[PDB]
Ligand binder design. Structure first.
Ligand SMILES: CCCCCCCCCCCCCCCCCC(=O)OC[C@H](COP(=O)([O-])OCC(O)COP(=O)([O-])OC[C@@H](COC(=O)CCCCCCCCCCCCCCCCC)OC(=O)CCCCCCCCCCCCCCCCC)OC(=O)CCCCCCCCCCCCCCCCC
Ligand SMILES: CCCCCCCCCCCCCCCCCC(=O)OC[C@H](COP(=O)([O-])OCC(O)COP(=O)([O-])OC[C@@H](COC(=O)CCCCCCCCCCCCCCCCC)OC(=O)CCCCCCCCCCCCCCCCC)OC(=O)CCCCCCCCCCCCCCCCC
Ligand SMILES: CCCCCCCCCCCCCCCC(=O)OC[C@H]1O[C@H](O[C@@H]2[C@H](O)[C@@H](O)[C@H](O)[C@@H](O[C@H]3O[C@H](CO)[C@@H](O)[C@H](O)[C@@H]3O)[C@@H]2OP(=O)(O)OC[C@@H](COC(=O)CCCCCCCC[C@H](C)CCCCCCCC)OC(=O)CCCCCCCCCCCCCCC)[C@@H](O)[C@@H](O)[C@@H]1O
Ligand SMILES: CC(C)=CCC/C(C)=C/CC/C(C)=C/CC/C(C)=C/CC/C(C)=C/CC/C(C)=C\CC/C(C)=C/CC/C(C)=C/CC/C(C)=C/CC1=C(C)C(=O)c2ccccc2C1=O
Ligand code: HEC
Ligand code: HEC
Ligand SMILES: CCCCCCCCCCCCCC(=O)O[C@H](COC(=O)CCCCCCCCCCC)COP(=O)(O)O
Ligand SMILES: [Cu+2]
Ligand SMILES: [Cu+2]
Ligand SMILES: [Cu+2]
Lengths: 58, 301, 223, 139, 186
């Protein structure tokens, strides 16, 4: 995000297509994106994992 | 029945599409199997294992089973292994790129429309040769003391390709690409501004049109082995590109091999697209899509 | 040069055709016709980055340019050959005139600016708000050619000043005033933006009064 | 505290393996070069876990078993003195407001707003850090 | 006896480990832009001098020693030794910052700027973010030295000194990586 703000406000060449920056962004973003979708999965696994034993008497 | 287990894929018009459809159907079946198994297991315990009226003495407190957690961790590995094998087998086929194609197309995507250019034609029967490359016009895109990126400014546009025959789309006319049937086809993709999406649903395929494919280490050229159906098929953009992302469709019209030469000759004479299709007893405008209304919407006088 | 008139046409049909048409006649409710606008309009719109536009809002903003000088000239010449109109002034070498546009009389330029241009812009060429989502920009970024071609065309909501209303001698004085009022240092300290009472009041409240209250709290006691 | 230390180096081994595999498999039969973008990330992902693992290992070797790390431990073992916790403070909201001001300044590119935001941030952080250390007023 | 882990230290360790992934982006940008160089990676206007970056690096490498000496003084109960060593550390850090600024001015004069080239962008971004971390460290020194004279020298103040030292040993270890990867591996 800082890199992108630098491009927009200071006129730098970070994500220029000629510079191989179209796919730099995708790598950097998808390194975040998928762990992000696993951040909002595991705690809600734990909630149901806590709830199941109580109502099953087991 | 392939009309219910394909979940609504179109039938292929190319060998690769037909091969891909088989893998899709097989995968759908193999997923519904495990879905049914697990749903049955969930339903079984929710209908029989319940609290009885005459029920005391809390049930058996078992929570470990060693020779069952090692068994149920092996079957999914074997399931995924075969799927991986078939995936590899199919994916290697869809990207072959035979050295000698029979027609090369230069596809360029700009801001909310298309342009198609016939690079070269070389039939296998030695009955038609044409070379449409235009380097003189290509030379007029060059920019330069030193330049920012590799000794040039971002305003280079050298990577684009220009040809003698080019169909151009407008805001009031859908661009139509004309191809022969039963022939090997190239597609070489390049973009002027941003990323676009090349999708023809009947091909069961799509590829991103990038502003610098070479500099970004990404293949921007695919082949079709042959097409065995004459007619008109739709294509549309499948990558977010701005306000008019949803309004830059196109059409592909496949005709008989002999009609292709007549169309090419008509275009060589100086006729437009609409004046060439009419010359080979074909509708001039698109029949799968029509131009969008230029107005903003229905709240405007 | 015909070698320049065809390189500017292939640039147009790849970047401009969606909003302006293939025959420069304009796409209804998407963009206007470009017949009779001239190369001055093209120069101003493309050099400052306003074109090509990206969406339909209250006002199309400026941004980094999409093409370079050669391509700008090509596009301008292609447009000029399709209905005429104004032209960008050149110098003895054919390049766009920058230094030769600066007028001698800055005092006359000053009050011409104050009568004609200070209503939308500021006293010295800052911004100004317009009706609904529109505004007059800051003039501290434009070069002489851009300042000259802005009033020759009347870009978006700025009125149009012909060469008969403002002769190409008063325009030079105006551009001289605009270029001088942007590159002269403040006398008497930091400029504080150049708007007047509002930044002054905020500076007072946030510096002077804070310091005074801090000093009072240091000298005095609590409870 | 061995379980804590082990949990990190378990990840470290996998991360190192993944980075090494990715780097080599890309050098040959992969278009372009070594794919510097993905290679860089994994070789620092390993470092993230390595630092914490090493620190935890050293701390575990330094101190002996705690009531928390003991199987058959009694509640009476942990009785005593925990430490200091802040009961209340209104400084966090001021810090957040200062940072918000700086961010809004940076978004619209208003240097004066950025400067004001930075000054506010410094003042708020000073207020937070010098909270339980100010002495009585001298008169 | 001591039989517990210092949680003010484990908190700062985990945060410092997380902060290492921020520089991952910058390193990725540098290595990506370097790949598409073609010919000479530092372009024609760019000329890196080792006549100024070496002494500055040596100073930034001599600060850690003084910092560790201050920490050693902190663990004994000495409040004055800590102050003396931390002041010296602050001065050396300030020297680093001023040297870096001078080099920036020199480079800008010869035509190496952020909008000028693709090299300039990555160079200035990486080195500027490192400079920002250094300034943060200096601010931390000032705040801690101001706090050390508000109250009696308790173990908590020693803990604060130790964690600040941890942070400093993270600004100079990331500059030996950058210096190695910029001035030697060109
Ligand atoms: C060029 C433009 C920029 C500058 C212009 C605007 C800024 C002007 C600054 C005006 C401040 C004038 C202060 C003069 C006294 C300084 C002498 C001194 O040592 O006072 C000791 C005094 C303690 O003695 P005391 O009066 O008996 O207080 C009773 C107890 O000790 C303490 O009892 P307490 O519980 O009430 O204490 C709580 C409070 C005590 O602190 C204060 O009272 C600060 C006063 C702020 C008042 C502002 C009004 C806010 C209205 C909203 O603690 C804090 O607020 C911590 C904040 C840290 C201060 C900011 C650090 C500077 C960062 C620079 C940016 O503490 C301070 O006031 C020092 C903080 C002032 C920093 C001075 C730095 C000098 C340079 C000015 C900045 C440029
Ligand atoms: C930029 C210039 C632009 C031009 C603008 C004009 C500039 C004029 C500046 C005048 C500012 C406005 C009025 C304030 C007058 C200050 C007079 C004063 O208080 O000093 C006498 C002061 C009397 O203070 P006090 O009234 O008894 O306050 C005691 C309080 O009850 C309770 O306080 P405490 O005794 O418990 O101690 C708390 C703390 C005071 O509390 C604070 O520290 C407040 C937080 C501010 C620090 C954060 C700075 C921002 C980070 C950048 O003590 C300290 O001062 C910390 C000393 C260590 C700081 C430096 C360590 C790093 C060494 C690096 C070399 O006597 C001293 O302690 C000696 C220090 C004086 C030397 C430094 C003053 C600067 C002189 C500059 C001349 C050039
Ligand atoms: C306790 C005692 C009392 C204290 C009193 C304090 C006063 C201290 C004064 C110290 C200065 C001494 C030297 C004299 C001044 C001087 O020699 O003058 C330099 C030149 O400078 C500006 O030229 C910029 C370039 O140099 C030019 O190239 C460029 O052309 C020009 O552009 C203008 O003109 C173009 C043409 O049209 C337009 O295109 C364009 O738009 C624009 O208008 C540039 O101007 P500009 O944008 O203003 O930015 C300048 C740079 C840098 O400036 C400089 O060099 C030096 C600046 C010195 C100022 C020092 C002030 C001290 C304040 C603190 C730092 C802030 C913290 C306080 C917060 C609270 C406290 C904590 C609790 O950025 C900054 O950081 C600005 C400083 C930020 C702080 C100032 C006030 C902030 C108040 C906050 C209010 C918001 C509250 C919100 C609450 C919700 C113009 O003015 C010129 O005339 C002028 O010539
Ligand atoms: C009646 C009327 C006109 C009111 C309009 C109210 C209104 C809609 C305000 C919108 C303001 C903003 C910030 C718009 C952007 C959208 C947005 C982010 C909205 C707020 C979102 C929100 C609630 C978030 C959390 C709050 C938060 C973190 C902070 C908000 C940011 C803040 C505090 C900024 C606003 C402060 C403000 C409006 C001050 C302006 C006052 C003055 C006098 C400034 C003018 C000024 C100028 C113009 C200078 O050039 C200058 C140059 C050098 C020195 C000084 C100045 C100077 O002071
Ligand atoms: C291809 C790069 C171009 C060029 C050379 C120009 N445009 Fe645009 N444009 C659009 C709209 C809605 C307007 C009118 C409102 C406003 O000015 O913002 C314009 C305006 C112009 C002008 C001004 C002509 C005048 O009448 O004086 C000029 C010279 C111009 N343009 C050149 C919309 C679009 C658009 C659709 C979004 C696209 C694409 C372009 N413009 C691209 C170009
Ligand atoms: C109100 C309407 C006016 C008046 C009377 C003048 N201008 Fe200005 N101007 C106005 C607007 C709304 C805009 C923006 C149009 C656009 O972005 O398409 C402008 C633009 C300019 C510019 C170009 C912007 C730049 O690059 O900074 C210049 C140089 C300019 N205007 C100058 C100018 C002068 C010299 C005027 C009087 C002689 C003048 N304007 C009048 C709004 C308005
Ligand atoms: C947006 C985040 C980017 C931060 C990167 C830090 C930059 C280090 C400064 C190096 C100076 C080099 C300048 C140069 O050669 O080009 C100069 C332009 O660079 C600048 O203006 C730099 C200002 C950056 C703002 C400082 C940090 C922003 C604060 C935000 C806090 C939230 C001159 O270039 P030019 O003359 O136009 O060719
Ligand atoms: Cu995913
Ligand atoms: Cu598109
Ligand atoms: Cu799209």
């Amino acid at each position: 995000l800082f890199g992108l703000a630098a491009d927009r406000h200071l006129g730098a060449h970070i994500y220029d297509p000629a510079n191989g920056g179209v796919l730099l962004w995708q790598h950097l973003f998808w390194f975040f994106g998928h762990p992000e979708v696993y951040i909002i999965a595991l705690p809600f696994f734990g909630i149901v994992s806590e709830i199941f034993p109580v109502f099953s008497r087991k | 029945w392939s009309d219910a287990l394909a979940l609504g894929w179109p039938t292929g018009i190319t060998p690769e599409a037909k091969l891909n459809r088989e893998l899709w159907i097989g995968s759908v079946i193999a997923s519904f199997a495990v879905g049914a198994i697990v749903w049955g297991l969930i339903f079984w315990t929710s209908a029989f294992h319940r609290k009885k009226a005459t029920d005391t003495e809390l049930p058996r407190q078992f929570g470990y089973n060693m020779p069952l957690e090692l068994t149920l961790t092996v079957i999914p590995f074997l399931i995924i292994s075969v799927l991986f094998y078939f995936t590899v087998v199919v994916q290697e086929r869809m990207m072959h790129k035979d050295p000698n194609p029979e027609v090369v197309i230069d596809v360029t995507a700009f801001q909310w429309n298309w342009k198609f250019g016939y690079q070269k034609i070389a039939f296998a029967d030695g009955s038609f040769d044409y070379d449409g490359a235009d380097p003189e016009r290509k030379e007029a895109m060059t920019s330069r003391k030193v330049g920012p990126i590799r000794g040039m400014t971002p305003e280079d546009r050298t990577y684009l390709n220009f040809d003698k025959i080019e169909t151009l789309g407008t805001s009031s006319e859908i661009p139509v690409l004309v191809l022969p049937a039963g022939k090997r086809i190239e597609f070489v993709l390049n973009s002027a501004d941003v990323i676009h999406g090349f999708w023809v649903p009947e091909f069961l395929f799509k590829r991103d049109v990038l502003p610098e494919p070479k500099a970004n280490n990404s293949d921007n050229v695919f082949q079709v082995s042959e097409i065995q159906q004459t007619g008109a098929f739709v294509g549309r953009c499948t990558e977010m590109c701005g306000t008019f992302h949803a309004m830059m469709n196109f059409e592909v019209r496949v005709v008989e091999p002999n009609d292709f030469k007549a169309y090419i000759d008509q275009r060589n004479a100086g006729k437009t697209n609409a004046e060439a299709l009419a010359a080979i007893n074909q509708p001039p405008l698109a029949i799968t899509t029509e131009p969008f209304e230029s107005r903003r919407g229905e709240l405007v006088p | 040069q015909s070698a320049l008139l065809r390189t500017g046409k292939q640039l147009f049909e790849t970047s401009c055709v969606s909003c302006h048409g293939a025959n420069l006649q304009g796409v209804p409710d998407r963009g206007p016709s470009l017949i009779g606008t001239g190369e001055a309009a093209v120069y101003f719109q493309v050099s400052t980055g306003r074109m090509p536009a990206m969406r339909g809002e209250a006002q199309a903003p400026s941004k980094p340019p999409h093409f370079d000088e050669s391509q700008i000239d090509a596009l301008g010449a292609y447009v000029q050959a399709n209905g005429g109109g104004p032209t960008v002034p050149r110098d003895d070498h054919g390049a766009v005139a920058q230094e030769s546009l600066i007028g001698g009389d800055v005092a006359r330029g000053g009050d011409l600016f104050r009568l004609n241009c200070a209503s939308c812009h500021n006293f010295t060429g800052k911004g100004g708000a317009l009706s609904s989502g529109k505004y007059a920009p800051d003039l501290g970024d434009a070069n002489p050619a851009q300042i000259y071609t802005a009033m020759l065309t009347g870009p978006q909501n700025m009125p149009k000043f012909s060469d008969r209303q403002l002769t190409p001698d008063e325009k030079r004085d105006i551009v001289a005033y605009v270029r001088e009022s942007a590159e002269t240092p403040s006398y008497g300290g930091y400029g504080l933006g150049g708007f007047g009472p509002a930044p002054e009041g905020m500076a007072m409240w946030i510096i002077g009064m804070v310091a005074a209250i801090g000093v009072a709290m240091w000298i005095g006691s609590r409870a | 505290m061995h379980i804590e230390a082990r949990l990190f180096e378990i990840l470290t081994a996998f991360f190192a393996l993944a980075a090494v595999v990715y780097a080599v498999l890309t050098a040959m039969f992969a278009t372009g070069g070594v794919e510097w973008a993905g290679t860089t990330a994994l070789v620092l992902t390993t470092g993230l876990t390595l630092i914490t693992g090493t620190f935890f290992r050293f701390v575990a070797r330094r101190l002996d078993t705690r009531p928390e790390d003991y199987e058959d431990a009694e509640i009476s073992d942990g009785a005593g003195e925990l430490g200091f916790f802040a009961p209340h403070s209104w400084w966090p909201i001021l810090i957040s407001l200062s940072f918000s001001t700086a961010a809004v300044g940076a978004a619209l590119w208003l240097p004066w707003l950025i400067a004001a935001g930075v000054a506010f941030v410094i003042t708020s952080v000073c207020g937070l850090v010098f909270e339980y250390y100010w002495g009585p007023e001298k008169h | 006896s001591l039989n517990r882990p210092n949680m003010v230290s484990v908190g700062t360790i985990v945060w410092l480990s997380s902060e290492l992934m921020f520089f991952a982006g910058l390193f990725a940008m540098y290595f990506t832009a370097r790949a598409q160089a073609g010919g000479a990676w530092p372009p024609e206007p760019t000329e890196l001098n080792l006549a100024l970056a070496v002494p500055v690096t040596l100073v930034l490498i001599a600060s850690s020693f003084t910092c560790q000496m201050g920490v050693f003084a902190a663990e004994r109960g000495d409040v004055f030794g800590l102050r003396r060593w931390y002041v010296i550390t602050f001065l050396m850090g300030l020297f680093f910052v001023l040297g870096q600024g001078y080099e920036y001015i020199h480079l800008v004069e010869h035509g190496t700027t952020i909008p000028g080239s693709a090299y300039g962008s990555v160079f200035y971004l990486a080195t500027g973010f490192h400079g920002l971390h250094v300034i943060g460290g200096l601010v931390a020194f000032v705040l801690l030295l101001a706090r050390t004279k508000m109250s009696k020298f308790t173990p908590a103040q020693a803990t604060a000194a130790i964690v600040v030292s941890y942070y400093w040993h993270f600004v100079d270890i990331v500059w030996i990586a950058l210096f190695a990867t910029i001035y030697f591996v060109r």
